[PDB]
């Protein structure tokens, strides 16, 4: 520590950690960029890749979301109690990565003709998750232990995301209604949920959601 | 162990696992999946996300070739040597993840009228590479550290695969270049490098390279 996430001020890929780092009590600092800030041409050549969110802890300068998402976990301890657990977390984060990932392409490329296609396909891509759910102890646990790690807010957020997008989308998949109804519900998540910083902070970059 | 790799007929995302397999000392089986197999419809349904390679290590089945990596990673010890490296390990290898995807769109999706644009963008995107080992170490060791971890292997791979798609690519990057020598050199590399069980293998499923 201290902990201090910089970027755009969205949702978008910082609101999983923000979640994460609020259940887990840490106090961290938000350093905003506008788009006109970051047009300035100063600060993105600074980014090891171009991009943001920079994500400092200490003297430790990150970036890649995932990556930050990750080293919270090993951090924090939320990222399983063996070798093979972390398998199974590390298999579901990269799938959610995965499939997030389309959701950004349909946001900022092609929502308007895009949006029917990718809301009718989009009950295939759930379903794993729900599998996943279905084998560990009923979904009535986490995404892959008896404990919650960095997947599981990644799990979380993504989910939530796609209740705006195609609402009722989970409707058929009894499990991960459940798996959202009761995260959320956690005091520290629920608290940062009804917050302002969050409630008054647009899901994506462009106006599309 | 024991290793059994289930993937198509190509290099792709899992050469630079078998890769590693084979630094390492180890040996693993090959059970490999012809498309007509696959479209066949027989494996797919059971695949958690559609999708191979599917890897087994003992009893343990996972998937997608990132939590892969990442698993021989922490089995095989070669994840860094504390918590700062480990995070520094994953962010670069989500950065290869990223050039590594824009490669495969091109190719099954654009490589005719695309390459012109993806070799001129691509110093662009290799920079960070030769950034990052300029800094650890003068660019004697590996990316990260000075122990090899399996953030060098995608690496190499990645670096390896554009060479063909471009040469000469990595003639303004010395650093980057004398990596790509180094790693080749080393004995178990070379000879998988040199293995026609390798060589005969297209680097991708539509021979397009
Ligand atoms: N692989 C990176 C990608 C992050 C990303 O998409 N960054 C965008 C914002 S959502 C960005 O920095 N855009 C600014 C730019 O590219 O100029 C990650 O997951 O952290
Ligand atoms: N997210 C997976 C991607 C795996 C993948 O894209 N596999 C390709 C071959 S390179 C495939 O053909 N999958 C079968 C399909 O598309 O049905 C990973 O990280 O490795």
Redesign the interface.
């Known amino acids: 520590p201290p902990y201090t996430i910089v970027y755009f001020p969205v949702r978008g890929r910082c609101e999983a950690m923000r979640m994460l780092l609020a259940d887990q009590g840490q106090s961290w600092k938000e350093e905003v960029v506008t788009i006109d800030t970051w047009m300035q041409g100063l600060l993105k050549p600074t980014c090891?890749?171009?991009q943001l969110p920079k994500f400092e802890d200490g003297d430790?300068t990150?970036?890649?979301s995932?990556?930050?998402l990750?080293?919270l976990g090993?951090?924090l301890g939320l990222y399983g109690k063996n070798?093979?657990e972390?398998?199974q977390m590390?298999?579901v984060?990269?799938?959610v990565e995965?499939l997030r990932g389309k959701y950004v392409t349909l946001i900022y490329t092609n929502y308007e003709n895009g949006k029917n296609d990718y809301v009718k396909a989009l009950p295939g891509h759930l379903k794993?998750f729900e599998?996943?759910l279905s084998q560990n102890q009923g979904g009535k646990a986490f995404i892959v232990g008896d404990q919650i790690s960095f997947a599981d807010y990644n799990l979380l957020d993504l989910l939530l995301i796609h209740q705006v997008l195609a609402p009722g989308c989970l409707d058929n998949f009894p499990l991960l209604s459940a798996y959202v109804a009761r995260l959320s519900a956690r005091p520290k998540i629920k608290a940062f949920l009804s917050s302002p910083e969050h409630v008054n902070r647009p899901i994506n970059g462009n106006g599309k959601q």
Do not use: V
């Open positions: 090891l890749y171009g430790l990150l970036y890649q995932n990556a930050i990750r080293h090993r951090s070798q093979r972390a398998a590390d298999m984060n990269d799938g995965d794993p599998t996943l």
